[PDB]
Write a protein that binds this ligand. Structure first.
Ligand SMILES: O=C(O)[C@@H](CO)OP(=O)(O)O
Ligand SMILES: O=C(O)[C@@H](CO)OP(=O)(O)O
Ligand SMILES: O=C(O)[C@@H](CO)OP(=O)(O)O
Ligand SMILES: O=C(O)[C@@H](CO)OP(=O)(O)O
Ligand SMILES: [Cl-]
Ligand SMILES: [Mg+2]
Ligand SMILES: [Mg+2]
Ligand SMILES: [Mg+2]
Ligand SMILES: [Mg+2]
Ligand SMILES: [Mg+2]
Ligand SMILES: [Mg+2]
Ligand SMILES: [Mg+2]
Ligand SMILES: [Mg+2]
Lengths: 424, 426, 424, 425
């Protein structure tokens, strides 16, 4: 009997030492589940609102008010509902908040309850979460897109691109892909040490050295792949997240690598990178609201490379719909906490999948020991996950949980590999 | 512990009184589930093989051999597997058979076990089948595409079009859609009596009068719509299944409505219908291997109407992929028994959806009391189902189950309505 | 086995008209479902079937009947023991408070009555035939199959309502079923050869517009022989004249182009007896033509079973009058003609103890409900009438008899020719 | 009963992306529990043996052999036993391996089963781990000793001391102490950015700037405390882990801040820090085997500050029994994976605890999302835990788990705060 009996939240700390919400949901059958809520640094203007305390505790980053909203309003709204009725529960939370951006109770108070209900429902059914959420057809292990050299908002350097990722598309299985990524990341550490370069980690576990720009970073990573005994392209390809909204000024343009430049100018830069490097994917090449820019870039390089919308779409169906209509991007980055409920997230995934767009399930720069996105990647069959360097366990715990999913699936497991990236 | 412990099969009768397979699967936790297998009349060349006994019993249509395959071979292969591992079970059945068209064990022996395993898994997990299969986001009640006037292979008349369907797209909910369709169906019976035409039912529960051609049939159904107090198009729209393979001869062409016609002439006929009637969907306008014809027809009218691949795709990922690459059809009919496992069926569904194609879960003309397809339609969010006139309970039991699913979902239920048919605009 | 919840809903029957479905849940978690059939050729004296009138569904909605279940019936039975069928049925009959169940509706009452019976059986972990009929329940009935349909059940001018085949010589139910299916498919091919319609009437039988009764019977005899079986010894014939439907009070029986007295109809039937292997004739005469039934029964009732349907309406009061007057020698049993399982069992008892045979019957409007299959075995009738072997509202009953036969194993007995002692 | 029915292991990755062992234990009653094994960088000579595959995969660091050893040998040797009899299980593990340093089957293979069996037993009794191991009297929340400025073996800078730690001894509860340490950690980041120093993290989530001296590091931390609105010493104190073995050369001596130094010159160093800074604890101030330096340093300054043996004792009853006899240090760092069973860990703690020595439960520089040391700190009533900066979740999950334990204890919880460091005043 999976009727919701108690809902409780607490303040815990994320992987940067900042407060976040963790929710536990208890069912009348004795089922108990826990979910934690991630937190971003390069957050788009259109993200669901995260409710912070202000005041002096934790530099203004407390979430006691989010915890109190769970105990005082959310709990009582959902107690007595069937945990299996995810859409009902998510609708109730959306209606109770009553604002479009979840500003009254906080996307952070709402999402923790939304995800803990999904987990309890799965546990009560005695199904692994990937299988509860994706049904019995769920089986595809994602290519891990590993941010091993971290810039922009995620470290304290003057490198413009936020994320330089490796993608072990050539591996035969997820267990092998994970090994290739780890061995490239360890080879990079060694290449950096041998040059003069810093091996201090950024927020997502990648190295934060201070190199001349994009191409210097890509040559360092190409060297790391070969050092690991692997082939650039055939074995391990490359991806970027520019988070270009972060180096866009309205009225001025793209303040990038020395120059102020236009959308078409940024487009020609990326196009140059595609001819010289085995790039499979480029994320947020232009800013969150540069629609005309994105439309021109997509027509120009969209056939040759995946173009992923992050801050332009914010995991938001209305925004993704406009993107699909205006021919903007060909992939959606899927961040549960940019929209605030599991239901809206799955509506965004469906809208993308049916529009011929791919999805890549994503962590935030502020993560926790929660591993739910690993199960989500498998459930939605995205074939792509972005959840950090293979270092710092808020990143590694997700990789370890994909090992467990792959092993439980046994012979039915399939690794997305090359097929995740048909344009390459 | 939803581990499979026993697998039993028996011979039951379908809704034409012919033999078919029913399978029961028991799990160690005590769960027990039963699934039955449907049978087609107008069966594509490329469907998974349906194993029949031959000989004298039941006119050669026995399925004792399929039943014996389940007890001697399939059962022992799957006992000890976890029912939750649907893909592992389905791969094991495929491999055990060892042939591309399931001809050794039969797609009928294989699918019974595939479907019973899925039902057992869902009951063990204590989730309704739509929710087990579709996960917690499943919620969309399909438009019921109701075949209210039956021709071709489903009756003994000279009507070449197999299926003349009504589609209550304008209804606010599934419960109301089902009412509109039943009301048109009862109005049609009345119009047929008035015209002195036969109200004897065909295989799928629709009237089987021997009307002169497509336009006579469409005109009798528009009258039924208006007589039920509904607006053709905006409230209740129309659809066809020509099952054109059944009137196509190789090189000769389409023997249709008293003349021989090419794929292009068939296309001009359909375009003529679209201009004159509120059609939302045409299925199998052309023959199962007329790939050149289908590509031309899709480019010609595919923007104005949905065009559904049935015998051309046979719920087969390999054939669907070709279609998508060659610009053939913009929708897939989904028939679990055309391919023979739940897994391959869901692989064909995902591939259609990701390819911009729509899907429509289908009964066969030989159905049973089994209601799995109602839950499956909700599970995949097709927004479209084809499962009979609202008459004969092997059709109506599915509608009844959709009423039960819509009730279970409470305020989260959504009816696909006219959003299932964007190309249409009364 | 305490009753905890009672819900009803409106579903559709096999002709697409609304009808009642009820669910009963017990304290122990048991949950059972039952549906109500509906006739077309309904006797004047049947329990009242409550319809909504107004526009929905051409007046044939049953929302009022559903509302009666939720408002009044459920509250009255919640807390009773589902095992106490006789106490529950008495409670239902007392709550309505009218002789013909016109206040709440026979459809609202029967649905709760059957659903209580299913729930008690599930609760005891017993198939329904065993729950109701106890350890001695074991007889598989001869399936009396209406393979050519006329009168009320199609749109032709054939006056006789049902033309049935009865596979009396089969060694088992499973073989009886195949025999009736083989003859049915042989009839279809005979009709096509003659250029006659193979469209189905309401009960799955072909509805050709044949010249009259002997034309129909000749076509069925041909079908029996075409299937390799002997008319009589293997597959016999039965009729349901539904004569109430062609009788007009004060004028007589308007039948095959002439107007006839009860006596002339008796002569017609006796003529059929001499020319064809008939084992049973139902409603040869009208529902209140008591004198006519008396004379006919004395005239031909030694040579053939004579079944009262519309004359008795499964009603102890009417049957007791028929017995006293020498009217018929068998009872057709329809749960929905009287409105409770208890009162149905009492009609059976009164018939059985009075040496009258019984034949459990569908209505022309059926559902996917299969209760009558279990009921026929539970009461030992040896005879069931539930359609041609086509249309699953008919066929689901035959499939359920296969399952019952299977579960009985070596205790199963097929009633075969012992159901028809007057024949041969 | 809680009888062991299956034991599985798998290769996972640790917080630096190197393989390590994870084990699952399933009881006949349905219970399934999971434990993971950590791995150090600055590993002592005398630690239990960490079985690595060698070869090509993972730069030689695979643990497929350790995983295989669990399936082939340890699994069958413990199935059938009662998960409640920790001592009998740990004895069967130690005897099976048969070597004193666990080199045949691997300390990593053995520990994983030892801890997964304890987690299973706890889950079967429906008890949190702290309460299962520690019994009803387990209630003390430890002071979090937070390595917020990382050097030595845990980064690539020229900083000699391995760990610069803050200790929120003045907080009224664990929940408050956690926030104090987070706030100092965040204030240090902003200080370092001011000074144009690196805020890139080392292995344990602490900043790894390349600052000049030990005093340069303590001055930056000191400013951080003050900038966080807290009082150095009274609110937040300082601790050190010098990991001296990592800069000791047998023969030539202590190579430290550009000078070879004797045992007694370093002491002179440590006692200078004691006067200028609010220090409550100095760990491994001398080398793993420098038995006389320790005895002298401990006489010299052990009255005034906690002196923690790590590499010198390696959570090993024998090595510690020695340190006590020879007046060496006054605290033991407790690493379950330096000794390889839970029983032997609890034995080494008991030796220390009866003998006057304080204990500090420790992480390894390679951690996982496992949180068992949080519960182990509380079970044994240590009052001190060393488990990283409040950043990187392989650290932070331990702190979050201490929040939940504090919650669950309710009014029974006591924060050890000031009472953990009696010599400080
Ligand atoms: O930009 C992103 O995609 C994310 C994850 O790498 O970072 P943040 O959570 O800071 O937005
Ligand atoms: O053609 C079809 O689509 C089906 C369903 O109506 O008919 P059959 O099962 O006979 O193929
Ligand atoms: O007359 C009968 O015996 C029944 C069933 O065959 O028909 P109706 O349900 O239409 O009364
Ligand atoms: O030296 C230590 O005390 C530990 C923990 O900080 O590091 P390592 O695990 O590398 O030995
Ligand atoms: Cl006819
Ligand atoms: Mg961002
Ligand atoms: Mg981004
Ligand atoms: Mg067909
Ligand atoms: Mg078709
Ligand atoms: Mg009747
Ligand atoms: Mg009758
Ligand atoms: Mg060390
Ligand atoms: Mg140390």
């Amino acid at each position: 009997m999976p009727i919701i009996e108690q809902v409780r939240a607490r303040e815990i700390l994320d992987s940067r030492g900042n407060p976040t919400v963790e929710v536990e949901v208890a069912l009348i059958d004795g089922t108990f589940a826990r979910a934690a809520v991630p937190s971003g640094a390069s957050t788009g203007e259109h993200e669901a609102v995260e409710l912070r305390d202000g005041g002096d505790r934790y530099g203004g980053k407390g979430v006691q008010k989010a915890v109190q909203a769970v105990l005082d309003e959310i709990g009582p709204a959902v107690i007595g509902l069937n945990a299996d009725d995810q859409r009902l529960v998510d609708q109730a939370l959306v209606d109770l908040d009553g604002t479009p951006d979840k500003s009254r109770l906080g996307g952070n108070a709402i999402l923790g309850v939304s995800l803990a209900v999904a987990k309890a429902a799965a546990d009560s059914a005695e199904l692994p979460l990937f299988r509860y959420v994706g049904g019995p057809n769920a089986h595809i292990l994602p290519v891990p897109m590993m941010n091993i050299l971290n810039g922009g908002a995620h470290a304290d350097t003057a490198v413009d691109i936020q994320e330089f990722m490796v993608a072990p598309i050539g591996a035969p299985s997820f267990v092998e892909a994970l090994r290739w990524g780890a061995e490239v990341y360890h080879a990079l550490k060694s290449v950096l040490k041998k040059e003069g370069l810093s091996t201090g980690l950024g927020d997502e576990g990648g190295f934060a050295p201070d190199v001349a720009g994009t191409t210097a970073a890509l040559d360092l990573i190409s060297r790391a792949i070969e050092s690991a005994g692997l082939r650039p392209g055939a074995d391990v390809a490359l991806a970027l997240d520019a988070a270009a909204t972060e180096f866009f000024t309205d009225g001025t343009g793209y303040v990038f690598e020395g120059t102020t430049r236009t959308a078409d100018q940024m487009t020609e830069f990326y196009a140059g990178l595609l001819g010289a490097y085995p790039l499979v994917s480029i994320e947020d090449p232009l800013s969150e609201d540069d629609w005309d820019g994105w439309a021109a870039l997509t027509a120009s390089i969209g056939d040759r490379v995946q173009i992923v919308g992050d801050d332009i779409f914010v995991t938001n169906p209305e925004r993704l719909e406009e993107g699909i209509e205006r021919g903007v991007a060909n992939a959606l980055l899927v961040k549960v906490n940019q929209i605030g409920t599991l239901t809206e997230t799955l509506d965004a995934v469906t809208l993308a999948h049916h529009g011929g767009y791919r999805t890549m399930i994503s962590h935030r720069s502020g993560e926790t020991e929660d591993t739910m996105i690993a199960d989500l990647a498998v459930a939605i069959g995205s074939g792509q996950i972005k959840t950090g360097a293979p270092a710092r366990s808020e990143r590694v715990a997700k990789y370890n949980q994909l090992l467990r999913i792959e092993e439980a699936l046994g012979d039915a497991a399939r690794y997305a590999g090359d097929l995740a990236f048909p344009r390459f």
